[PDB]
Amino acid sequence: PNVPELILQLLQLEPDEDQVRARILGSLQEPTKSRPAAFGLLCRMADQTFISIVDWARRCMVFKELEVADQMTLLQNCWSELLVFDHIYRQVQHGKEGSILLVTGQEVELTTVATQAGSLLHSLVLRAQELVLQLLALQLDRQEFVCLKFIILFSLDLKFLNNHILVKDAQEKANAALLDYTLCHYPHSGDKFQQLLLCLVEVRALSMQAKEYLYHKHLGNEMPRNNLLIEMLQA
């Protein structure tokens, strides 16, 4: 069966997980100011994840051909959702329900989260793992993941954008590609396209919960200054 052209391009724009892991692992060796040292390392890791996500958005087809005011507005709207989705798909590729995989490749056991994390983080992780299980049951592959990511990037009410017809095109074009792909390849357990969209709704709800967790840490004054994610949290 054929594959939509928009997906095939999104596949070739995807950075391989090894060079992103090395770049992030390499940036975590750079020295910094002390005052927990692992909490500081995890914040920086998440930060570097968001940088390579911006680097991915910069290379995409419709995003590149967009002026800066619109580029910023899109990313400001979808940043945590793109971070959550990146974590989720990592867990899909990491088929181990007893632990979570980090972008650096280190595994953290769920038992470790359950006794060392607060309720908010632990809730947030368990909820995310529930979505991981549903995506594995729906047999999420890489063609849809790339398509999903591109839908998240542009899934914004068109009022807030200036180069508006360019964006409208993208949304329809990405929905049709995901529709066309799931119909030819997954015709067995119901409306895959619809189920995947229902996942988008859950990724949005997870990303708000994630934003609430950052706000909790922020009120605790435990968040390192200059942190990229809390600066995103405030625009």
């Binding site: 911006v54 800066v68 990313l75």
Partner: peptide, 12 residues
């Protein structure tokens, strides 16, 4: 003034 912008308008 902004951070996102900085990242966006970066090398290459």
């Amino acid at each position: 003034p902004s951070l996102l912008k900085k990242l966006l308008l970066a090398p290459a």
